[PDB]
Design a protein around this ligand. Structure first.
Ligand code: MG
Ligand code: NA
Length: 354
């Protein structure tokens, strides 16, 4: 019988000399016990959804600020650092960005001259998006995910870049423009990150390594790498995680762990247990060991790691459940955090609080 999260020692306090402790939040989770857990264990937050491009500009010139503002207000009120997630991504990004002046998808265009025009139009839209959003949240955001997931899992081109709508339309230019615009409007002091998953493993790691070396050499402003750390119990290895973080630190970049979850399953996450109560104790203990080693590593690397954020708060809310449902016929429960669905501490908590 584990105690409630607000009854144990604060994680932020335990790691205050090492790094921020962060959580991804939705507006509705800012009160209640989620609220209470946040104020007690965390000194940083990020918007799980309320700040992605489609959440902020769903039609051109129509900005929808309420959710994001609610999160800001809460960070402000509770003296918490705030990551911005995210200025550019190829999902939860609104359709209108990528349509030509006659409403057709720019990617379908076959004329090399109109494509060039479409590239100028898209980059202009991006610049206008970035400038507006940054200008509003400039004074509260302490770290910016300028771009998210622009590096490919494979290698479809020279630079190892995701051939998303952004790249198909503009090559690598949106990346340069994203950072340069974000620097421009946020000021020299703002911390700009390139955020991604599987940063721990090659080829992707090397591509990002190469890419940030390139961009830096050309004076494109980029302060750090965001390691999503959607990880599993036995993968990636501790040595892979360290090597990625220490490589990027070698370049003078900051590292943050930005969306950490420790799934009870592999990839794809099958077989999942159908409910939390069905999850055998065995799995909470393998997770607990994984967390112990993971936070041993983080603390060891704390010279080069400023923030560790979980992609959620307690196991009642986690996108991993969508994945579990997806790969197990609509019924499936994961449990990635150190607090359970009822805000009680899990074996993993004790392993990282000490
Ligand atoms: Mg420990
Ligand atoms: Na640190």
């Amino acid at each position: 019988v584990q105690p409630a999260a607000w009854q144990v020692a604060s994680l932020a306090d335990r790691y205050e000399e090492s790094f921020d402790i962060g959580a991804a939040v939705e507006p509705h989770q800012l009160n209640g016990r989620q609220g209470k857990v946040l104020k007690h264990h965390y000194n940083s937050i990020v918007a799980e959804n309320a700040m992605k491009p489609i959440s902020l500009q769903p039609e051109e010139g129509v900005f929808t600020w309420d959710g994001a503002d609610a999160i800001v207000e809460f960070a402000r009120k509770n003296n918490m650092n705030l990551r911005f997630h995210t200025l550019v991504w190829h999902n939860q990004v609104p359709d209108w960005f990528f349509l030509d002046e006659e409403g057709n998808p720019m990617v379908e265009e076959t004329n090399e001259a109109k494509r060039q025009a479409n590239k100028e139009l898209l980059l202009e839209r991006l610049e206008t998006h970035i400038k507006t959003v940054v200008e509003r949240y400039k004074d509260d955001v302490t770290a910016w995910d300028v771009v998210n997931e622009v590096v490919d899992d494979g290698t479809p081109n020279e630079r190892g870049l995701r051939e998303s709508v952004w790249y198909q339309i503009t090559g690598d230019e949106y990346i340069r423009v994203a950072f340069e615009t974000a620097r421009k409007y946020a000021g020299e002091d703002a911390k700009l990150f390139i955020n991604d998953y599987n940063t721990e493993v090659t080829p992707k790691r090397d591509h990002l390594y190469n890419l940030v070396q390139d961009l830096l050499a050309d004076g494109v402003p980029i302060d750090g790498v965001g390691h999503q750390a959607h990880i599993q119990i036995d993968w990636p290895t501790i040595d892979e995680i360290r090597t990625s973080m220490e490589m990027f630190a070698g370049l003078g970049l900051d590292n943050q762990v930005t969306e950490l979850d420790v799934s009870l399953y592999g990839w794809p996450p099958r077989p999942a247990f159908p409910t939390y109560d069905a999850i055998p104790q065995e799995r909470f203990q393998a997770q607990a060991d994984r967390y112990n080693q993971l936070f041993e590593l983080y603390e060891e690397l704390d010279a080069d790691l400023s923030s560790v954020t979980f992609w959620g708060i307690a196991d009642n809310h986690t996108w991993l459940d969508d994945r579990a449902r997806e790969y197990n016929d609509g019924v499936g429960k994961d449990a990635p955090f150190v607090f359970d669905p009822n805000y009680r501490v899990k074996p993993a908590f004790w392993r990282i609080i000490d």
